[PDB]
Amino acid sequence: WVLLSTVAAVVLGITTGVLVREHSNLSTLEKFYFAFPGEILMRMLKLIILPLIISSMITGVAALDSNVSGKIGLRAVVYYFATTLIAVILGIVLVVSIKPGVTQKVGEIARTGSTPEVSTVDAMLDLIRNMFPENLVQAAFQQYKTKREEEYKIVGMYSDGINVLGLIVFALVFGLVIGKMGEKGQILVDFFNALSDATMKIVQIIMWYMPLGILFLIAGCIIEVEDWEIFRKLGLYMATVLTGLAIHSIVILPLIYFIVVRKNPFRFAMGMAQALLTALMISSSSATLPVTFRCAEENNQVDKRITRFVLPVGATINMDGTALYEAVAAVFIAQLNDLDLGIGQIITISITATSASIGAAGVPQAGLVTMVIVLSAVGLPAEDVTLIIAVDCLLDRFRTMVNVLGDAFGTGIVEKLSKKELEQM
Ligand code: NA
Ligand code: NA
Numbered sequence: 001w002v003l004l005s006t007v008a009a010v011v012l013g014i015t016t017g018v019l020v021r022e023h024s025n026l027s028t029l030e031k032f033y034f035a036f037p038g039e040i041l042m043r044m045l046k047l048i049i050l051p052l053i054i055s056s057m058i059t060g061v062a063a064l065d066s067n068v069s070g071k072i073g074l075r076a077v078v079y080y081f082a083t084t085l086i087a088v089i090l091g092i093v094l095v096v097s098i099k100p101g102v103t104q105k106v107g108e109i110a111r112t113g114s115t116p117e118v119s120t121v122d123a124m125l126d127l128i129r130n131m132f133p134e135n136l137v138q139a140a141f142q143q144y145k146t147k148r149e150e151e152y153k154i155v156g157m158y159s160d161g162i163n164v165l166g167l168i169v170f171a172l173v174f175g176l177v178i179g180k181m182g183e184k185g186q187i188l189v190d191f192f193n194a195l196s197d198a199t200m201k202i203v204q205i206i207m208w209y210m211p212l213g214i215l216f217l218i219a220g221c222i223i224e225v226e227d228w229e230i231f232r233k234l235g236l237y238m239a240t241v242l243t244g245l246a247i248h249s250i251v252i253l254p255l256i257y258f259i260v261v262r263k264n265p266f267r268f269a270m271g272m273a274q275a276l277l278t279a280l281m282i283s284s285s286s287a288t289l290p291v292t293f294r295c296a297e298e299n300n301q302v303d304k305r306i307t308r309f310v311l312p313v314g315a316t317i318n319m320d321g322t323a324l325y326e327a328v329a330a331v332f333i334a335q336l337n338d339l340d341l342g343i344g345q346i347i348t349i350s351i352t353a354t355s356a357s358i359g360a361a362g363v364p365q366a367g368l369v370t371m372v373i374v375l376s377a378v379g380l381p382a383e384d385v386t387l388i389i390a391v392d393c394l395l396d397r398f399r400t401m402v403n404v405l406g407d408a409f410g411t412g413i414v415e416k417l418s419k420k421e422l423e424q425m
Contacts (some may be wrong), residue, residue, distance in 0.1 A: 003274050004347030010277070013215040026223060030130070030336070031292035035220025040145025041213025044206050045287040046362075048199060050140050051161060052290055053312050054171050055196035060308025061175030062189045069176065069309070069419045075417050076310045079410045080318040081354075083256065087248050087320035087355045087402075091327030092346060094244045100236040100328075106387075109233055109336065113389030115382050116365055118372040119248065120156065122146045129139075130359050133166035140167065164286055164316050165359035171312075196308070201330030203290040217281050221248050221393070230390045237388075241395055241405060245402045248376045257409045261416040265409070271299030272408045277406040283396045285315040288404055296411045303422055306415040314407030319357045320369060321402030326353040329367075330374040332385045335408075345378045352377045367392060 021024065026034065043157065058073050095101075126146055143163045146156040164321035178185030254265035261268075269276075275292040282288055292311055295301040330349050334341050342350075352374045360366030368389060372382040415422070 002207055004295065006214060006274060006277050009211040009214040010218050011283070013218035014222065016182050016215065017219030020184060020219065021223045025240045028031060029379045031220065031223050034223060035216050036186035037215070038213050038217030038220055040205075041217065042282060044213075045282065045284070046162075048203055048206070048221055048290050049201045049286050050167070051166065052174075052203075052293070053286075055192040055199060055307045056142060056293070056312050057168055057180070058192040059170030059189070059196045060305060060312075061172055062179040062185070062192070063308075064179070064182060064421075065131060065425065066070065066176065068418075069179070071421060072306065072309055073172075073313075074417050075315060075414050076410055080314060080406075083320050083406050083410075084318065084354050085350075087254055087324040088327045088350050090252065091241075091244045091324040091353070092331065092350060093366065094247075095238050095328040095331040095335075095342075096244075096346075097337060098236070098240045099239060100240050101332045102201070103236060104233075104336060106336045110230060110390065111386040113368070113386055114205075115385045116369050116372060118147055118369055118376075118382065119146075120373045121368065122148065123373055124355070127165070127355075127358055130163050130165045131169045133163055136167075136170060139163040153182050154390055161363060161410075162286075163359070164361070166313055181227070188327075189264065198291070198408065200293065203294065206290070211391070214278075214281050214319075218310065222329075228238055231394075236418075237329075238391055239393065240332070241325055241328050242398060244328055245321055245398050246321060248404050249325060249402050253409050255411055260413045268300055268409065268412055269405070272405065273387055274299075275404055276401050277398075279400040280397050283393075283400045284363075284398040285306045285400055285403045285407070288400070289315045292404055296408055300408075300412060302411045306418065307411050308413045310414050311407050314359050314410050315404070316359055318406050318410065319361070319399075319403050320406040322354050322357045322390070323369070324402070325367060325373050325399050326356045326370050329371055329388055330378070330380075332377050333371075333375060333380055333387065334378065337380060339378075339380065341378070348377050349374055350394055351383050361400075367399070367416060368395060 081093060126144060129144050138158060141160065141162055142158040143161045144153050144156055149155045168362055178188045257265040257268060272295045275288055275295040276293045279288040286332055289311060293307060296307045296311065327349060329376065330353065331341060356370040357366045368385050371385050375382055375384060
């Protein structure tokens with residue numbers, strides 16, 4: 001009933017959403033109140049991130065030996081990097097071959113939204129700063145950001161938004177320490193094992209409300225969009241983005257899973273359908289993590305030791321979907337400006353696009369912030385990001401699904417590559 005209700009909710013939500021806007025006329029305030037049931041689900045899933053991330057990372061690392069944990073972590077990191085690179089290369093090839101921007105002009109495309117003010121050096125240094133928060137309690141709900149102020153002086157401040165990067169790094173180090181302690185640290189292992197189990201049970205309670213929240217979540221966004229002809233001007237740009245995401249999700253990732261794990265990848269992906277559908281509706285890899293936990297464990301029979309480690313980390317640093325999107329968007333913006341891109345310029349977009357949304361799964365405008373960095377790398381104005389924000393919300397839905405799908409396949413791949421370790425213990 002859990003999966004069926006989710007499918008029923010989207011159909012009713014899409015049916016309700018299209019009918020409401022086509023027949024009824026709603027103001028901006030009336031549109032916001034319509035999506036309120038979905039909004040409640042959004043903050044019920046966000047409420048679970050902190051307890052889930054902390055107890056999963058501590059419990060997963062603490063359960064394994066130091067060497068076993070290191071090898072499992074090394075395998076996951078290689079898979080994260082390997083798949084993100086392939087996603088970027090696929091985006092580069094598709095956008096270069098399809099040439100979405102060479103068939104269009106800058107003037108014709110409408111400009112929407114505001115381009116964020118980003119410093120490439122400060123944004124990347126902020127990544128390392130957030131890995132090591134100054135306060136653990138503050139990191140639970142706030143993040144650090146630095147701005148250049150004046151001959152220039154760096155001023156930093158904390159803003160609302162959970163620092164998943166800092167919490168995961170501490171939870172990994174904390175899990176390693178309490179595991180080595182043994183009997184001394186057993187009480188902490190037991191405490192965070194119960195907290196992890198309790199958090200999963202609370203997710204089960206949230207799943208009861210998810211169908212009703214999903215209905216209004218999908219319905220609301222369909223009603224939010226006031227203009228549909230804007231999607232037609234960027235259709236070629238959208239087509240290449242979804243073509244790359246579809247190929248990565250349906251060809252590349254299943255192929256990698258099959259080679260490492262001699263099993264049907266679509267059977268594995270079928271078990272994740274509930275998590276993939278949730279990601280497609282909430283546009284957050286961290287908020288959909290609790291759903292990914294159940295699908296990987298309950299449906300795909302993936303080891304809980306592997307899942308507790310790979311999934312929380314993957315939701316934070318594994319963004320194949322976003323990395324592909326930045327590579328396609330950056331080259332597309334380059335083509336609009338009639339800017340020929342050489343091998344040197346193409347390469348730098350690849351490395352810059354790789355470091356996309358490394359601490360912003362669910363953070364809004366996370367893709368625009370990265371796009372500014374990627375565009376600035378090869379010298380295009382950061383104001384060209386305004387040409388993409390029109391359809392960024394829709395693409396964000398599909399980005400998150402591919403971001404979550406990469407994590408799910410990583411658990412199966414890492415589990416197979418560490419089979420000797422799990423049996424050895
Ligand atoms: Na990846
Ligand atoms: Na991810």
